[model samples]
Target: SHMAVIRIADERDRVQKKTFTKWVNKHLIKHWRAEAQRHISDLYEDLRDGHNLISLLEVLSGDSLPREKGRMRFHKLQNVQIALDYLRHRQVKLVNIRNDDIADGNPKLTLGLIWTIILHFQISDIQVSGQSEDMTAKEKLLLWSQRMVEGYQGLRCDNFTSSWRDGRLFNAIIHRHKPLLIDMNKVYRQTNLENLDQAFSVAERDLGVTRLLDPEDVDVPQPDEKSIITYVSSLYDAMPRVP
Candidate 1:
């Protein structure tokens, strides 16, 4: 008796969801316009190797500011977009799964599209690096994840952009549309606090920055071109270990 009642309730629930899908289909039809431009500057390419001229490296090296750096351009960005677009088409299924997991009280936060990015980056299954295989996707994503954290924090300090999201305040003034976006969910974004910190450290280390980016900002070790990669290795002797 209980099972049958639950079955009927589930049926109603599923049927009620169709209205949402209808609204979403229409929303995309209207609001899914492209950004101001599809092409980037030619100088954006001309990268040398896996790490050469990569935005992640430049940002960590402090060669570029948070707004100007770490944005990952190139055939790299193109390839990353292509890979993301492959799964972006399934935003419906992925978002639905996230909701489903929450409703069921399951700990499956990264079970869908989130894992899709993480998994693909770690493996060579996709072509985010193109033929050069120039950069470490794991490290690149680590930087990206940390930047998202900074973005969420409003970029007040600690070497990141307060306006990593739209940058509309600056965008309109500059009349430039090199804006960026990170498609993330609150629940999913929160789940990675611990591991992602570890990942961030791993990436910094990979960049050969063995010191503190900021002796003050403890959580992230804040890397920038002005960062003390010139200072990390011989100083602390006791560094935070990320497993």
Candidate 2:
């Protein structure tokens, strides 16, 4: 029966591949590209330290297993828990910021808060179902799709605000860094199962890669000269005069 179910899922995967690939290209990739461009200044720096953590976690957990089997791995479970804790801590900090600065229109902060909350709930689902070895691939795919949609929307909204504040960041990068632009397109173009597996591995691992114990320990990357100049110019343009 178990083998039968697996076979059914494998068949369904073949049938669904086109739809899923289109969906990823149309929605997920588009959103990621726009968001990346919008937050280009922050993206490189923010993601640097946390870049390989997700891939590493997936490697440690073993590859191409059923979702339940992957979740049941002790290290994977621990990583998810740690991610949840980090997200929760960020939520608390955001709340404090909101309460203290009523007049400040910190759209980026608000976006971060909302994203972290949503991700926390998703991680909670994984934690609760970690032991369930009987879960189906269909169920896992549904969850994966849902998470992708939620993340896409979050990035869209967040990047909209960020991009507005830093209008030229992405465009400048795209113009200067043609390779990155090509890579962004490639992220959407590849539709092989191997690519899908790699994407999933990266997403799961990076969902909560950074875990800073102390506020002072948080080491945001220093932008390069070009990025710094752009960032400063954008800030000045956004706020013509300091009150």
lDDT (Cα) of model 1 = 0.28
The Cα error of candidate 2 at residue 116, in Å, is: 3.2
lDDT scores in order: 0.28, 0.28
Model 1 spans with C-alpha error above 4 angstroms: 1-98, 102-105, 109-113, 121-203, 206-243
Q: Candidates' TM-scores?
A: 0.17, 0.18
- Cα displacement (angstroms), candidate 1, residue 241, comes to 27
Over 67-172, each residue of candidate 1 has an lDDT whose tens digit, in order, gives 2224444534443333234345435233443222322323233123323332332222222222334555443333332332344333222222222122221112
Looking at model 2, which ten-residue stretch has the lowest summed lDDT? Answer: 210-219
Q: What TM-score, to 2 decimals, does candidate 1 have?
A: 0.17
